């Protein structure tokens, strides 16, 4: 469960996911990568699920990198509460993925297993994923 160790402000304004890709746009640690095509909020739970899926379908020597990190927190008012009397308390952390950000990358294992691995990683995430390779 990826979680910031501490934050200066518990309840910040939400960060939009509409727009192009600011950073983490090109595979730069591995050479195959899973890009997103629709910005959305995805939480550390989906990240951990996808990472465990990748690790389970990896081998004995494959290596993986997680680019995105759930920096921003979000609140949720308790149920049966009418609006007012302040903001709700923070519940879960989501990493903000914009159209074009490479979330996971893999290397050091043959091509078919990595393609399958990225497929299973992307089926755990709501965004519609796509495979790209690293420029020589």
């Amino acid at each position: 469960m990826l979680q910031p160790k501490r934050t200066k402000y518990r309840k910040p304004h939400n960060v939009s996911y509409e727009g192009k890709a600011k950073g983490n746009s090109y595979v730069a640690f591995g050479e195959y990568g899973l890009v997103a095509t629709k910005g959305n909020w995805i939480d550390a739970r989906a990240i951990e699920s996808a990472r465990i899926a990748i690790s389970k379908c990896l081998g004995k020597t494959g290596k993986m990198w997680i680019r995105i990190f759930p920096h921003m927190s979000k609140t949720k008012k308790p149920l049966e509460v009418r609006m007012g009397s302040g903001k709700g308390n923070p519940e879960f952390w989501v990493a903000v993925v914009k159209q074009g950000t490479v979330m996971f990358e893999v290397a050091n294992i043959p091509e078919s297993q990595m393609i399958k691995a990225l497929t299973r990683a992307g089926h755990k995430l709501p965004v519609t994923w796509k495979i790209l390779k690293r420029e020589e």
Binding site: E80, V81, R82, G84, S85, G86, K87
Partner: protein
Amino acid sequence: SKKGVGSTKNGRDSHAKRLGAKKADGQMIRTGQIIYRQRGTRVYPGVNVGLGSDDTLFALSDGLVKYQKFGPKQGKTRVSVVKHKLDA
């Protein structure tokens, strides 16, 4: 059922102090008119421009106000009042 709700603690704000630039470049000015109000010297004073007890810049003579950029990496701003200088 309402079940009751907690209480918020920060709904407090102070009156807005009316700071900022008052006379724009090229505007004619007489002595004693405010050119720039600030909290801490955001605009330095030049010639024919004074300072107050609230870091307020005011004119000292007739003329056209004029801003001059100066300082390291061109990060400091300076204002002045170039006198009418009609000089026939």
